[PDB]
Design a protein around this motif. Structure first.
Motif, mmCIF file in Angstrom:
data_model
loop_
_atom_site.group_PDB
_atom_site.id
_atom_site.type_symbol
_atom_site.label_atom_id
_atom_site.label_comp_id
_atom_site.label_asym_id
_atom_site.label_seq_id
_atom_site.Cartn_x
_atom_site.Cartn_y
_atom_site.Cartn_z
ATOM 1 N N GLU A 1 19.251 105.648 -5.328
ATOM 2 C CA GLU A 1 20.027 106.429 -4.225
ATOM 3 C C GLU A 1 21.229 105.409 -3.784
ATOM 4 O OE1 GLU A 1 17.666 108.266 -1.608
ATOM 5 O OE2 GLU A 1 19.347 109.616 -0.980
ATOM 6 N N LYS A 2 21.042 104.228 -3.850
ATOM 7 C CA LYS A 2 22.153 103.273 -3.533
ATOM 8 C C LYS A 2 23.114 103.005 -4.862
ATOM 9 C CE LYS A 2 19.848 103.224 0.059
ATOM 10 N NZ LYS A 2 18.513 102.235 0.037
ATOM 11 N N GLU A 3 22.444 102.616 -5.923
ATOM 12 C CA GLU A 3 23.350 102.534 -7.196
ATOM 13 C C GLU A 3 23.993 103.873 -7.326
ATOM 14 O OE1 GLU A 3 22.325 102.433 -11.786
ATOM 15 O OE2 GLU A 3 20.761 102.236 -10.981
ATOM 16 N N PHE A 4 23.601 104.819 -6.804
ATOM 17 C CA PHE A 4 24.400 106.119 -6.917
ATOM 18 C C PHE A 4 25.601 106.146 -6.169
ATOM 19 C CE2 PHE A 4 25.000 110.889 -5.895
ATOM 20 C CZ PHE A 4 25.352 111.117 -7.148
ATOM 21 N N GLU A 5 25.481 105.947 -4.715
ATOM 22 C CA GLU A 5 26.579 105.859 -3.908
ATOM 23 C C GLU A 5 27.623 104.700 -4.384
ATOM 24 O OE1 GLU A 5 26.261 109.012 -1.405
ATOM 25 O OE2 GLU A 5 27.661 107.905 -2.518
ATOM 26 N N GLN A 6 27.169 103.723 -5.032
ATOM 27 C CA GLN A 6 28.061 102.835 -5.591
ATOM 28 C C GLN A 6 29.037 103.333 -6.605
ATOM 29 O OE1 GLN A 6 28.241 99.795 -7.805
ATOM 30 N NE2 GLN A 6 29.464 98.795 -5.976
ATOM 31 N N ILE A 7 28.252 104.090 -7.632
ATOM 32 C CA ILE A 7 29.007 104.288 -8.948
ATOM 33 C C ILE A 7 30.199 105.543 -8.123
ATOM 34 C CG2 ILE A 7 28.913 105.343 -11.027
ATOM 35 C CD1 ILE A 7 25.771 104.137 -10.821
ATOM 36 N N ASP A 8 29.646 106.306 -7.343
ATOM 37 C CA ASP A 8 30.137 107.535 -6.824
ATOM 38 C C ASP A 8 31.520 107.029 -6.177
ATOM 39 O OD1 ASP A 8 30.219 110.185 -7.214
ATOM 40 O OD2 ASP A 8 29.241 110.815 -5.421
ATOM 41 N N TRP B 1 31.529 106.459 -13.116
ATOM 42 C CA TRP B 1 30.427 107.009 -14.083
ATOM 43 C C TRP B 1 30.945 107.375 -15.412
ATOM 44 C CZ3 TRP B 1 25.663 108.111 -12.659
ATOM 45 C CH2 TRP B 1 25.653 108.222 -11.309
ATOM 46 N N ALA B 2 32.232 107.038 -15.885
ATOM 47 C CA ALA B 2 32.704 107.339 -17.166
ATOM 48 C C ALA B 2 32.256 105.998 -17.770
ATOM 49 C CB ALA B 2 34.223 107.626 -17.161
ATOM 50 N N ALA B 3 32.430 104.698 -17.056
ATOM 51 C CA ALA B 3 31.953 103.447 -17.668
ATOM 52 C C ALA B 3 30.530 103.237 -17.968
ATOM 53 C CB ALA B 3 32.514 102.461 -17.056
ATOM 54 N N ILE B 4 29.781 103.540 -16.849
ATOM 55 C CA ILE B 4 28.266 103.715 -17.058
ATOM 56 C C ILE B 4 27.769 104.163 -18.397
ATOM 57 C CG2 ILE B 4 26.011 103.898 -16.014
ATOM 58 C CD1 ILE B 4 27.807 102.123 -14.459
ATOM 59 N N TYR B 5 28.119 105.784 -18.593
ATOM 60 C CA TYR B 5 27.933 106.561 -19.526
ATOM 61 C C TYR B 5 28.428 105.904 -20.920
ATOM 62 C CZ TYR B 5 27.736 110.523 -22.813
ATOM 63 O OH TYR B 5 27.053 111.127 -23.761
ATOM 64 N N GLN B 6 29.615 105.316 -21.016
ATOM 65 C CA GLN B 6 29.777 104.437 -22.254
ATOM 66 C C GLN B 6 28.977 103.423 -22.531
ATOM 67 O OE1 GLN B 6 31.870 106.398 -23.877
ATOM 68 N NE2 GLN B 6 31.605 104.872 -25.494
ATOM 69 N N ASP B 7 28.494 102.750 -21.522
ATOM 70 C CA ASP B 7 27.700 101.671 -21.653
ATOM 71 C C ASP B 7 26.350 102.139 -22.472
ATOM 72 O OD1 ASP B 7 28.099 99.742 -18.512
ATOM 73 O OD2 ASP B 7 29.473 100.314 -20.063
ATOM 74 N N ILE B 8 25.992 103.319 -22.087
ATOM 75 C CA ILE B 8 24.857 103.727 -22.713
ATOM 76 C C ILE B 8 25.081 104.320 -24.154
ATOM 77 C CG2 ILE B 8 23.123 105.719 -22.703
ATOM 78 C CD1 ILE B 8 23.441 105.566 -19.685
ATOM 79 N N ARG B 9 26.218 104.905 -24.392
ATOM 80 C CA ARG B 9 26.755 105.312 -25.711
ATOM 81 C C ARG B 9 26.566 103.919 -26.655
ATOM 82 N NH1 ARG B 9 26.733 110.388 -26.737
ATOM 83 N NH2 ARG B 9 26.229 109.159 -28.607
ATOM 84 N N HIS B 10 26.924 102.957 -25.952
ATOM 85 C CA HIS B 10 27.190 101.689 -26.812
ATOM 86 C C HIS B 10 25.667 100.828 -27.202
ATOM 87 C CE1 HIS B 10 28.058 97.261 -27.617
ATOM 88 N NE2 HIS B 10 29.126 97.811 -28.079
ATOM 89 N N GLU B 11 24.915 100.790 -26.262
ATOM 90 C CA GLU B 11 23.673 100.211 -26.307
ATOM 91 C C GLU B 11 22.433 100.987 -27.060
ATOM 92 O OE1 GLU B 11 22.841 96.556 -25.636
ATOM 93 O OE2 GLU B 11 24.892 96.915 -26.333
ATOM 94 N N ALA B 12 22.958 102.180 -27.471
ATOM 95 C CA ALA B 12 21.776 102.930 -27.685
ATOM 96 C C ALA B 12 21.501 103.056 -29.215
ATOM 97 C CB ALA B 12 22.369 104.600 -27.658
ATOM 98 N N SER B 13 20.259 103.284 -29.499
ATOM 99 C CA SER B 13 19.890 102.763 -30.713
ATOM 100 C C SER B 13 20.352 103.921 -31.934
ATOM 101 C CB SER B 13 18.390 103.363 -30.777
ATOM 102 O OG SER B 13 17.425 102.764 -29.808
ATOM 103 N N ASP B 14 20.435 103.230 -33.056
ATOM 104 C CA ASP B 14 20.753 103.933 -34.354
ATOM 105 C C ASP B 14 19.613 103.530 -35.593
ATOM 106 O OD1 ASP B 14 22.608 105.406 -35.739
ATOM 107 O OD2 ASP B 14 23.325 103.476 -37.001
ATOM 108 N N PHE B 15 19.264 104.813 -36.070
ATOM 109 C CA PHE B 15 18.314 104.988 -37.173
ATOM 110 C C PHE B 15 18.737 106.001 -38.286
ATOM 111 C CE2 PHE B 15 15.870 103.632 -33.185
ATOM 112 C CZ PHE B 15 15.208 102.368 -33.656
ATOM 113 N N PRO B 16 18.225 105.680 -39.441
ATOM 114 C CA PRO B 16 18.473 106.820 -40.396
ATOM 115 C C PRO B 16 18.154 108.025 -40.261
ATOM 116 C CG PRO B 16 16.588 105.272 -41.139
ATOM 117 C CD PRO B 16 17.237 104.621 -39.954
#
Length: 284
Positions: free
Chosen positions: A4-11, A16-31
């Motif tokens: 809830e605090k993490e939220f108010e912080q990002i808001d 939000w657009a950079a958090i989301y891009q951090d996930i795209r970047h760290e996300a697994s890749d498999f065949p």
């Protein structure tokens, strides 16, 4: 960090657009070799959305076992989900074969058959009691038994019969009808209500097969549904509910299906839904 605090912080920071891009970047890749084979091009609705080979659902038949469907297995929460795309003309028969073979009890539907003036999935259930549907390639019959229509969602009782052995089962169809064409709902109130109705049905419980959930691609809205569920379930189960890191759960789920959560608006909405849900889970 209490989300809830993490939220108010990002808001306030409008990050939000950079958090989301951090996930795209760290996300697994498999065949995904099986999904990209040529004989399966017409089993895929979108070219950039395929299931990993390590977690794909297989149809029990020797011919061609492919379907665009993944098993997400959340081990700490003791929940399983099958995420799939909205079915195509030539895959409605495979879809209900999947439902049979995995012993599912519920189907969850987060999209309308037509959105933005185009077709977002096939009409894969029957709309009138007296007009049943038959699927000849997989030898299954499907019948509408009742229908209960509400402001925000509709619940249908269906009867799936295996023509080869004449067993029959009762499948519940949970259809969320009011997600807007663009963006996300302004309040999570009705989305959370929809979830608890799915929970109350038994369909998520381990005496059954895993639930089948889908939108058009099976990663956006479908992602929001099962990230929220799992996160709330973890807040119930732990000594310390503020230890639930929603980004870490998403990243664990993405080991099983690529793409889960498609925009930064969805990510935000997911936070929002968990925070309000928590205000029942923690006694209020």
């Amino acid at each position: 960090m209490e989300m809830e605090k993490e939220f108010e912080q990002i808001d306030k920071s409008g990050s939000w657009a950079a958090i989301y891009q951090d996930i795209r970047h760290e996300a697994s890749d498999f065949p995904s070799r099986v999904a990209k084979l040529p004989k399966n091009k017409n089993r895929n609705r979108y070219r950039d959305v395929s299931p990993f080979d390590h977690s794909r659902i297989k149809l029990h038949q020797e011919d061609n076992d492919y379907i665009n469907a993944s098993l997400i297995k959340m081990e700490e929460a003791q929940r399983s989900y099958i995420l799939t795309q909205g079915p195509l003309p030539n895959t409605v028969g495979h879809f209900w074969e999947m439902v049979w073979e995995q012993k599912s009890r519920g189907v969850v539907m987060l999209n309308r058959v037509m959105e933005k003036g185009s077709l977002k999935c096939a009409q894969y259930w029957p709309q009138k009691e007296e007009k049943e549907m038959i699927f000849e390639d997989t030898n299954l019959k499907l019948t509408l038994i009742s229908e209960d229509i509400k402001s925000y969602y509709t619940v249908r009782q269906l009867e799936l019969e295996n023509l080869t052995t004449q067993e029959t089962r009762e499948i519940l169809h949970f259809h969320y009808t009011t997600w807007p064409d663009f963006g996300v709902p302004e309040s999570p109130a009705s989305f959370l209500n929809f979830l608890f109705k799915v929970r109350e049905s038994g369909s998520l419980s381990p005496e059954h097969g895993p639930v089948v959930v889908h939108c058009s691609a099976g990663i956006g809205r479908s992602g929001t549904f099962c990230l929220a569920d799992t996160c709330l379930l973890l807040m119930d189960k732990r000594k310390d509910p503020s230890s639930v890191d929603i980004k870490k759960v998403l990243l664990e789920m993405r080991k099983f299906r690529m793409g889960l959560i498609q925009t930064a608006d969805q990510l935000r909405f997911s936070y929002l839904a968990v925070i309000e849900g928590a205000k029942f889970i923690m006694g209020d």
